Design a protein around this motif. Structure first.
Motif, PDB file in Angstrom:
ATOM      1  N   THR A 198       7.304 -13.323   8.557  1.00 40.36           N
ATOM      2  CA  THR A 198       6.373 -12.909   9.604  1.00 40.36           C
ATOM      3  C   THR A 198       5.672 -11.623   9.211  1.00 40.36           C
ATOM      4  O   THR A 198       6.293 -10.558   9.131  1.00 40.36           O
ATOM      5  N   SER A 199       4.375 -11.719   8.955  1.00 41.76           N
ATOM      6  CA  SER A 199       3.580 -10.537   8.691  1.00 41.76           C
ATOM      7  C   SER A 199       3.395  -9.757   9.990  1.00 41.76           C
ATOM      8  O   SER A 199       3.353 -10.343  11.080  1.00 41.76           O
ATOM      9  N   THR A 200       3.265  -8.441   9.873  1.00 41.70           N
ATOM     10  CA  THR A 200       3.156  -7.563  11.039  1.00 41.70           C
ATOM     11  C   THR A 200       1.714  -7.262  11.471  1.00 41.70           C
ATOM     12  O   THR A 200       1.499  -6.539  12.446  1.00 41.70           O
ATOM     13  N   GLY A 201       0.727  -7.790  10.753  1.00 45.82           N
ATOM     14  CA  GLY A 201      -0.655  -7.671  11.203  1.00 45.82           C
ATOM     15  C   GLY A 201      -1.663  -7.602  10.080  1.00 45.82           C
ATOM     16  O   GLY A 201      -1.359  -7.963   8.941  1.00 45.82           O
ATOM     17  N   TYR A 202      -2.875  -7.155  10.391  1.00 46.90           N
ATOM     18  CA  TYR A 202      -3.926  -7.172   9.388  1.00 46.90           C
ATOM     19  C   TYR A 202      -5.010  -6.147   9.672  1.00 46.90           C
ATOM     20  O   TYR A 202      -5.129  -5.633  10.790  1.00 46.90           O
ATOM     21  N   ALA A 203      -5.818  -5.868   8.657  1.00 48.39           N
ATOM     22  CA  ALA A 203      -7.033  -5.087   8.823  1.00 48.39           C
ATOM     23  C   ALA A 203      -8.111  -5.712   7.955  1.00 48.39           C
ATOM     24  O   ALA A 203      -7.821  -6.362   6.947  1.00 48.39           O
TER      25      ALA A 203
END
Ligand SMILES: N[C@@H](C(=O)N/N=C/c1ccc(O)c2ccccc12)c1ccccc1
Ligand SMILES: N[C@@H](C(=O)N/N=C/c1ccc(O)c2ccccc12)c1ccccc1
Length: 330
Positions: A198-203
């Motif tokens: 599970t990745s924690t997010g992005y930019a």
């Protein structure tokens, strides 16, 4: 023990990577696609339907003094992208970069689908997902990594894929000179047989980081980065003239564009994919419309951290009792 082998892009777009593998005695070297999204080691062979072989190097078990037919065993695999292959099974000695497994199941193709035939550079697959996904029947077989694991100095392998350049697969050790900073480890679910995390997010580019859980698989056998439609739309909205094309099958953008980077989270750490990694070139020869390297996973049923993402990192596939995944910048 350990092993270390160089992995090389098959073409100028990094569509896939091939790694030389020694099979049999005397050695027969085939160039295999190491695939952390599947669990079969299968090869073009002397048994493959002749019209379905077009330039691949073949394994000939009759020429190997260590090959043994695995009686009654067959295999058949259908990949998520619609391609497929099937055949019978031998056990033989398999070596990768100096690391040797005796009695490895080598699945010999009798049939392959058109996409395999049409790709002369890939002589087969070496699966590195969990053995629960292996398709051999009636007795499921273990992956190369599963067979080697107990003998390894540490129960790990690492993927260090290059951008438009060779890279490395290591087994049994972490090369501390191959990355910058530290390795951030993150939990894995093995329930579906994949390296699921599970990745924690992005930019997007220099934009602010969005904290959001993105479940997906680390898949060296998939070229692109497939993410939720919301995330993908946010990325392409930053590229003038980019659009989702139903006829082409995804987001396309003007080949004249300079693409922004894309950052994904691993715990509190951040992996930055440079914009250039996201350019997959003209949609057809001579076109000024280019195919995007970040695409929607809507319809797949799962997000896929394929080569576009993985090649921006040094990635540890930790096969300890409780598996985990590690990512470092490089
Ligand atoms: C087009 N679909 N591709 C599906 C796919 C590709 C690669 C994978 O590793 C998958 C894994 C699970 C489900 C679908 C896929
Ligand atoms: N582009 C990927 C791909 O489509 N992988 N799909 C894997 C997959 C998906 C769904 C399943 O249910 C599976 C089950 C066992 C093994 C693999 C899979 C790929 C990798 C290697 C060869 C062809 C195509």
């Amino acid at each position: 023990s350990t092993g270390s082998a160089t992995t090389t892009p098959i073409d100028s777009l990094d569509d896939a990577y091939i790694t030389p593998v020694q099979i049999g005695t005397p050695a027969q070297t085939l160039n295999l696609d190491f695939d952390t999204g599947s669990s079969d080691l299968w090869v073009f062979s002397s048994e493959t339907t002749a019209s379905e072989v077009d330039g691949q190097t073949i394994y000939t078990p009759s020429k190997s003094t260590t090959a043994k037919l695995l009686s009654g065993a067959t295999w058949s695999i259908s990949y998520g992208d619609g391609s497929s292959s099937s055949g019978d099974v031998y056990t033989d000695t398999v070596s990768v970069g100096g690391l040797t497994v005796t009695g490895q199941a080598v699945e010999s193709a009798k049939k392959v689908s058109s996409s395999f035939t049409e790709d002369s550079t890939i002589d087969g697959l070496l699966g590195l997902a969990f053995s629960t996904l292996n398709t051999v029947s009636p007795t499921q077989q273990k992956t190369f990594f599963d067979n080697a694991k107990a003998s390894l100095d540490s129960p790990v392998f690492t993927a260090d894929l290059g951008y438009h350049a060779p890279g490395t697969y290591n087994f049994g050790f972490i090369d501390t000179t191959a990355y910058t900073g530290s390795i951030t480890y993150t939990a894995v679910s093995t329930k579906q047989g994949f390296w699921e995390w599970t990745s924690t997010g992005y930019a997007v580019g220099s934009g602010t980081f969005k904290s959001t859980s993105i479940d997906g698989i680390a898949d060296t056998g998939t070229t692109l980065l497939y993410l939720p439609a919301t995330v993908v739309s946010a990325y392409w909205a930053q590229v003038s003239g980019a659009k989702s094309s139903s006829s082409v099958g995804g987001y396309v953008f003007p080949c004249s564009a300079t693409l922004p980077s894309f950052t994904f989270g691993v715990g509190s750490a951040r992996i930055v994919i440079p914009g250039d990694y996201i350019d997959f070139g003209p949609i057809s020869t001579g076109s000024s419309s280019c195919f995007g390297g970040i695409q929607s996973s809507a319809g797949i049923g799962i997000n896929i951290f394929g080569d576009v993402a993985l090649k921006a990192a040094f990635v540890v596939f930790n096969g300890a009792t409780t598996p985990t995944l590690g990512f470092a910048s490089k």
